Every structure is written in C-alpha cells, then in structure tokens.
Write a protein that binds this DNA or RNA. Structure first.
Ligand SMILES: Cc1cn([C@H]2C[C@H](O)[C@@H](COP(=O)(O)NP(=O)(O)OP(=O)(O)O)O2)c(=O)[nH]c1=O
Ligand SMILES: [Mn+2]
Ligand SMILES: [Mn+2]
Ligand code: NA
Ligand code: NA
Length: 327
DNA sequence: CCGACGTCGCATCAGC
DNA sequence: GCTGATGCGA
DNA sequence: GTCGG
C-alpha cells in the first residue's frame, strides 16, 4: 500500500473520527472510524466501491455508503458542512492543544474563545498543563528524528546512571523498535529496591537531575511512579535551537519491569496479536504481568519474569527483535 | 435487539 | 479539609 | 459505527 492509494478515503474517515471524539464526544464512533481507516490503509488495492470496502473487518453499511458518495462526488456533504461550522470546527481545532480535551474545548468555544490567539488573550482560564500545551503548540506537533532521539537517550541514560548506577532505564516506544522518527520519548525506569512487595523519591531524584542539567524544561504531571513533561537538547553552538519535546518517565517494580518494557515497546497491533495469541495457550498478559488460566478461567498468581524473552517462552514463541514488531 | 467497544496515573473539580 | 468523580493523555 | 451473543 502506497500513501495516496486510498488516501482520500482514509483522510475522510480520520476527519470524521476526530469530529466524533472532539465535538460529538462519541468515543466509540471515534475508534470505529479509525479502525475503518486502518484496515483500509492496509488494503493493497484502490477501492472501487463501498460494497468492496464493506468486506473488510470494521467497515459496515454506513461507511460503505459514505465511500460511495466520496467516489461518485469527490466529497462528503456532511463533512463539508461541519467543516464550515464555525462552532464545531473551532472545538475540533482547540483540542490540538495538549491539555484541552473535548470538554474544555467545548466550554472555551461556548464563551467565544475559538483560536490560539483567543487562548493567548485568556491565560487566567488555562490550567498548568494547558498553558504548556499552548506554549509549545507547534513543537508538540513536530516529529523527532532518530538522531535527536539517540542524543536524548545519551543524556537520559548518562544522568540516570549518575544519580544511582543501580538504576535500569530503557527508552521504549517506537524508538526501541528502530523507527527513523518518533512522536515522543518513552522512558521506563526501575531499581533493585523497588518491587511489588515493597522509597518513592526514586522517580523524583531522576527528574530533578534532568532538570538540574537543564534537559527537562517543564512538567505536565508528576507522581510517585509516572512523570509527564517537556525536554530539549542543548543548542549546538550559535545554531538554530531544537524544538521542545514530550518525554514520559515511569517507575516500575523490578518484577513488573520487562512486562512493562514489552508493552510500552509495542507496537499497538503487535501487542494485541501477542495478547490475543497466548490467550489461545491459556495465559493472560497485561501491562504488569503474565498470569495463567485457569481451567474454567480463573487466573492464578503472576509468573516470574526477568527478561523480555521470558514472556515469549511462557507462551511458546521465538523471541522477536523490537525491530520486527510493527505487527 | 442491544451491549461491548481501552485502561490507568495524575490534576483538578464537585460534593460534603 | 477529605473523598470520589471527571477530564485528560497515551 | 461495527460487530456479534
Ligand atoms: C497509547 C498506547 C500505547 N501502547 C504501547 C505501544 C506503544 O508503541 C507504546 C508507547 O506508546 P506511544 O508512545 O503512545 N506509541 P509509540 O511510541 O509506538 O509511537 P510514537 O513515536 O510515540 O508516535 O506503548 C499500547 O499498547 N496501547 C496504547 O493505546
Ligand atoms: Mn512514543
Ligand atoms: Mn508515549
Ligand atoms: Na465489514
Ligand atoms: Na488536546
């Protein structure tokens, strides 16, 4: 499948998906449209009719009809209409600010606040997260070249070890799968002193060090186990400076760590296949653990895990490199 | 016909 | 002031 | 909106 092979259809479906989530607040319709757009994006033929498309899992009657209208006319009356709707288009747009969801966007537009400019005029109505999202609106929509990610990893691994050399840190997500660009940086953190059985400054101390060396620039949220924030590489001499980036750091017990690494490495569809299969061998994998069923379905206690590959053993599959986990 | 469909940590709100 | 609900991101 | 018990 190439980009423009069914691009107009998947663009249409994705656009419909966003208005469902952001304006209609119909979240299951949101996933319905995305699932349709995903299965169509994978389909290796230029679609000729809605009936043709309806054969794919997740494409039903209503989308089949919409595809017919699109193929025949090059557009969709309902989408064109909501595109001109000042209220609805504004609500959908404002949700592009991290921290502004469907609800907040709704209330902003209710009281006349419709644009980024409007948001800038109204700081006192923004919470902390929303202000950061506004401040880095442009930066947050850019992707991160692997080269910068590697440099980001350099700093994170270095500063983590410097705080305590017994920390274990892993940059997972699309980076660990070897993607040539990434949307954010997903850092997983553990330490021998932290198990399920059992201080919680363990995460605080890492964040503070990365702040001290001015890598982490802002904080969206921060608890005892999960940090969400903003970071930036140092500017290489008198050159154009780097965009601010999203970084997550989360602290995981040692005995749950590699289940965590596996999950937060992904990808999405790989994770389900691997969750999905492995059902058919009587195990339940979650973000934290693998547990055995269970002759009529009662999960017993979590099994020991000390490597990624461990999990693969349990469910009888060859350890697969992160590089081949897109599906 | 009709309910499932993605869950969970953190920030902030709503109610007492 | 405390407890639970809601919004949010991913 | 789609699927399926
Ligand atoms: C959000 C999400 C994440 N994950 C796992 C797989 C993701 O690859 C991994 C990290 O989530 P991500 O950062 O939201 N996606 P990504 O890192 O693969 O891609 P990107 O570069 O951030 O765009 O965690 C899921 O399995 N289901 C999810 O719904
Ligand atoms: Mn990521
Ligand atoms: Mn992420
Ligand atoms: Na179908
Ligand atoms: Na948003």
């Amino acid at each position: 499948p190439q980009e423009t092979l069914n691009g107009g259809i998947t663009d249409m479906l994705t656009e419909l998906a966003n208005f469902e989530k952001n304006v209609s607040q119909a979240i299951h319709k949101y996933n319905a449209y995305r699932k349709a757009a995903s299965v169509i994006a994978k389909y290796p033929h230029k679609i000729k009719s809605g009936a043709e498309a309806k054969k794919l899992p997740g494409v039903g009657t209503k989308i089949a009809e919409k595809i017919d209208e699109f193929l025949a006319t090059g557009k969709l009356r309902k989408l064109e209409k909501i595109r001109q709707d000042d209220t609805s288009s504004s609500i959908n747009f404002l949700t592009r600010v991290s921290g502004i969801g469907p609800s907040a966007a709704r209330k902003f537009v209710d009281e006349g606040i419709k644009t980024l400019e409007d948001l800038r005029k109204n700081e006192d109505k923004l919470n902390h997260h929303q202000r950061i999202g506004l401040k880095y609106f442009g930066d947050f929509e850019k992707r991160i070249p692997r080269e910068e990610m590697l440099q980001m990893q350099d700093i994170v691994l270095n500063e983590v070890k410097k705080v305590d050399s017994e920390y274990i840190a892993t940059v997972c997500g699309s980076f660990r799968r070897g993607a040539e660009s990434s949307g954010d940086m997903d850092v997983l953190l553990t330490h021998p002193s932290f198990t399920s059985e059992s201080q919680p400054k363990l995460l605080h101390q890492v964040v503070e060090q990365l702040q001290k060396v001015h890598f982490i620039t802002d904080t969206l949220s921060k608890g005892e186990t999960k940090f969400m924030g903003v970071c930036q590489l140092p500017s290489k001499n008198d050159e154009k400076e780097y965009p601010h980036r999203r970084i997550d750091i989360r602290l995981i017990p040692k005995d749950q760590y590699y289940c965590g690494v596996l999950y937060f490495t992904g990808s999405d569809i790989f994770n389900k296949n691997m969750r999905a299969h492995a059902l058919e061998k009587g195990f339940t994998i979650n973000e934290y653990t693998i547990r055995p069923l269970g002759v009529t379905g009662v999960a017993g206690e979590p099994l020991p895990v000390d490597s990624e590959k461990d999990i693969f053993d349990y469910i009888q599959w060859k350890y697969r490199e992160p590089k081949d986990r897109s599906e």
